[PDB]
Amino acid sequence: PSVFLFPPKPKDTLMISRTPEVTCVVVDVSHEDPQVKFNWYVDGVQVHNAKTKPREQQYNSTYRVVSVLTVLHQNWLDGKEYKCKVSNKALPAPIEKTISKAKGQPREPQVYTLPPSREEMTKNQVSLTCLVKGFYPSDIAVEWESNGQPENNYKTTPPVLDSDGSFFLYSKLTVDKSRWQQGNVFSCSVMHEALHNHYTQKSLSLS
Amino acid sequence: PSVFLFPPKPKDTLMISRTPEVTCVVVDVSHEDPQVKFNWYVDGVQVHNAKTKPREQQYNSTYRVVSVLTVLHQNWLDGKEYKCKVSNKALPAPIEKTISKAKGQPREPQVYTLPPSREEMTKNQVSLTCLVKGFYPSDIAVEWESNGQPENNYKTTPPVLDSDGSFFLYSKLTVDKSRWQQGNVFSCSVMHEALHNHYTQKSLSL
Ligand SMILES: *[C@@H]1O[C@H](CO[C@H]2O[C@@H](C)[C@@H](O)[C@@H](O)[C@@H]2O)[C@@H](O[C@@H]2O[C@H](CO)[C@@H](O[C@@H]3O[C@H](CO[C@H]4O[C@H](CO)[C@@H](O)[C@H](O)[C@@H]4O[C@@H]4O[C@H](CO)[C@@H](O)[C@H](O)[C@H]4NC(C)=O)[C@@H](O)[C@H](O[C@H]4O[C@H](CO)[C@@H](O)[C@H](O)[C@@H]4O[C@@H]4O[C@H](CO)[C@@H](O)[C@H](O)[C@H]4NC(C)=O)[C@@H]3O)[C@H](O)[C@H]2NC(C)=O)[C@H](O)[C@H]1NC(C)=O
Ligand SMILES: *[C@@H]1O[C@H](CO[C@H]2O[C@@H](C)[C@@H](O)[C@@H](O)[C@@H]2O)[C@@H](O[C@@H]2O[C@H](CO)[C@@H](O[C@@H]3O[C@H](CO[C@H]4O[C@H](CO)[C@@H](O)[C@H](O)[C@@H]4O[C@@H]4O[C@H](CO)[C@@H](O)[C@H](O)[C@H]4NC(C)=O)[C@@H](O)[C@H](O[C@H]4O[C@H](CO)[C@@H](O)[C@H](O)[C@@H]4O[C@H]4O[C@H](CO)[C@@H](O)[C@H](O)[C@H]4NC(C)=O)[C@@H]3O)[C@H](O)[C@H]2NC(C)=O)[C@H](O)[C@H]1NC(C)=O
């Protein structure tokens, strides 16, 4: 019986409208003893339930049980810890997993736009770069938009630990060289705990 | 037990100056169940001690008998399959792990250097950027230099899969806004299998 804890997505805890959740997954719950008991703790409190919500399923030759705990944006942002306790009769002792945002003071991310290299504008498509550095924790979200709509041909590198101990990454948007020249303006939106309304934005054009 | 094979460092297979090596790491070997044996096979051949060399342990309460094999840059680059065959008493059966380089037509990388952003010109330090895309496989080594001398304060994002099945990454050198003001010239070095002479170098400056 294995147990994996999953944290909410970066955007979920940054937007009051979204719904952030902590998910507890248990794989390899034998066919014989499919009983699984979940106990949830938020800073060690709640052996007595909470929102909670399990379901039940069947796979290869084992069982999979998922429990979902909705969390409060500020509880997560305030570093609270979430414990999932999985008890199974076919287990020597209960298995406990715990997760939260990384410990450390939140640093504001610096977002810069970077136009393509002269030596690339000789190809049908160029690269519009968006540098995001000095942020912490690593939880973060990046997106691109040219006009009132998303650009879907871009990639973001995963965050990287700088010498600072803060985090940095690069998102690369790929545009038809023809567009970038038509004077079009693009922008990457970065969402982080340390940004004003959990959001800043930077423009990039050909002027 | 628990075996894990590791491929050589990209930079090692691209320059004969260095020696590539397939490192076989076995964890959690018991005190009462030591005596760890090895066996390396390159494309089937070699069942008897090849040119290996393993030793050293001690951990959290376990072992870890790490074996090491010397690789031939050509052998690896051509895709020969390296097979580590561990054998232990406290192990139900003979575990195994193989590995060869990522298969597929290699693709030379494009290297572009970028100036720091106008907006970043407000800090006591700036960011010299190096973009690298269109390369396959992902094994790649990126370094920075200034008039012959090495740069230490730089970080490189790992290889990321782009839409076309090729990879790209970014390297970032942190330098004093002054050095960039003085007009110094920095260079981005890229080592890859598909580059002529396994090496290309791009420059940037004010
Ligand atoms: C019997 O069947 C079961 C189901 O199999 C399914 O597969 C298909 C092919 C078919 O066979 C059918 O049977 C089923 O459809 C098998 O269950 C599997 O069991 C293994 C355990 O051996 C699980 O492996 C773990 O996977 C997680 C990641 O899982 C996420 O992503 C998967 C896609 O890649 C996806 O399939 C998963 O469902 C899950 O998705 C997430 O789900 C949540 C909830 O819905 C969502 O909110 C997310 O959005 C969603 N994400 C995405 C993307 O979709 C992985 O994290 C685990 O790795 C960690 O742990 C390893 C130790 O075991 C360790 O080696 C790793 O390095 C890694 O370590 C972690 O490192 C991080 C930092 O990076 C630390 O923070 C962690 O602390 C640390 N972990 C710890 C605590 O050690 C691991 O690989 C597998 O997910 C599961 N399959 C599914 C699906 O449930 C079963 O194995 C099989 N055989 C038997 C009998 O076992
Ligand atoms: C007792 O201590 C031991 C060591 O623990 C450490 O932390 C504390 C406990 C300390 O007290 C101290 O003991 C020690 O510092 C524990 O052993 C540990 O066991 C785990 C699980 O087996 C190991 O994790 C695996 O790590 C692999 C990567 O190893 C490299 O990277 C790590 C960190 O990144 C580094 O520490 C290692 O040294 C190693 O680094 C490489 O070393 C080479 C030689 O030195 C060198 O040439 C390389 O350049 C260097 N590279 C780096 C990283 O720099 C992962 O590969 C493993 O993941 C695979 O396997 C798991 C299954 O276990 C999969 O779930 C996972 O997905 C992945 O493989 C799958 O997915 C890939 C991706 O798609 C796919 O290709 C595969 O086909 C697929 N197959 C598999 C296998 O599933 C693990 O994470 C851990 O490293 C090891 N400890 C160390 C540091 O060696 C004991 O557990 C502990 N107590 C116990 C329980 O006994």
A129, A114 in Cβ contact below 8 A? yes
Q: Which two tokens stand for residue B193?
A: 């299998």
Please indicate whether, in this complex, the C-beta atoms of B119 and A112 are within 8 angstroms of each other.
yes
Question: Ligand 2 pocket check: which of B25, B27, B61, B101 to mutate, most ligand atoms within 8 Å of Cβ?
Answer: B27
Q: Give CA–CA dist A117/A143, Å, rounded.
A: 21
Would you say the CATH fold of B101-206 matches that of B2-100? yes
For every residue of B102-169, DSSP letters joined together read PPS--BPPEEEEEPPPGGGTTSSEEEEEEEEEEEBSS--EEEEEETTEE--SEEEPPPEE-TTS-EEE
Rounded to whole angstroms, the Cα distance separating A148 from A21 reads 29
Instruction: Say yes or no for a CB contact (<8 Å) between A170 and B170.
Output: yes
CA distance A173 to chain B (A): 11
3-state class (DSSP) for residue B4: strand
- Residue A38 neighbours by CB under 8 Å, 6+ apart: A24, A52, A54, A65, A67, A84, A85, A86, A87
- Strand pairing partners for A34? none
Q: Which helix (H) or strand (E) holds B177?
A: helix B177-181
Q: In what order do the strands lie in the sheet with A95-99?
A: A37-42, A82-87, A95-99
Q: Which residues fall within 8 angstroms of residue B205, CB to CB, at 6 or more apart? A: B180, B183, B184, B185, B186
With CA atoms as reference, the chain A residue closest to B114 would be A117
Q: At B120, list the tokens.
A: 């970043």
Domain B101-206 has CATH 2.60.40.10: yes
Are A136 and A108 contacting, i.e. CB atoms less than 8 angstroms apart?
Answer: no
Write down the experimental method used for this entry. Answer: X-ray
Smallest Cα–Cα separation from B65: which of B100, B101, B89, B99? B89
**CATH no. for A1-100:** 2.60.40.10
Type of residue numbered A128? L
Residue type, B16: I
A60 lines ligand 1 (CB under 6 A): yes
* Nearest alpha carbon to residue A40 among A92, A2, A81, A12: A81
Please give the Cα distance from A9 to A140 (Å, whole number): 9
| Edge-to-edge order in the sheet of strand B40-42 | B40-42, B82-84, B97-99
CA distance B161 to chain A (A): 8
Probe residue for ligand 1, chosen from A3, A4, A28 as the CB with the greatest number of ligand atoms within 8 Å: A4
By the 10 Å C-beta count (0-12 exposed, 13-18 middle, 19+ buried), A5 is classed as middle
From the list B9, B6, B109, the residue with the least C-alpha distance to B67 is: B6
Name the phi and psi angles at B20, rounded to 5. Answer: -65, 160
Q: Is the CATH number of domain B2-100 3.40.50.10710?
A: no
Give the Å distance between the CA of A133 and the centre of ligand 2. Answer: 29
Q: Where are chain A's structural domains?
A: 1-100, 101-206
- What is the least distance, in Å, from the CA of B120 to any CA of chain A? 7
Say yes or no for a CB contact (<8 Å) between A155 and B170: no
Does the bond joining B7 to the residue before it have cis omega, within 30 degrees of 0? no
> Which of B112, B121, B205 to mutate against chain A (most A CBs within 10 Å)?
B112
Note the helical H segments in chain A. 73-77, 177-181
The CA angle B192-B115-A120, to the nearest 5 degrees, is 55
Largest CA distance in chain B: 66
Phi, psi of A134 (to 5 degrees): 60, 30
Burial class of residue A8 in the structure, from the number of CB atoms within 10 Å of its CB (0-12 exposed, 13-18 middle, 19+ buried): buried
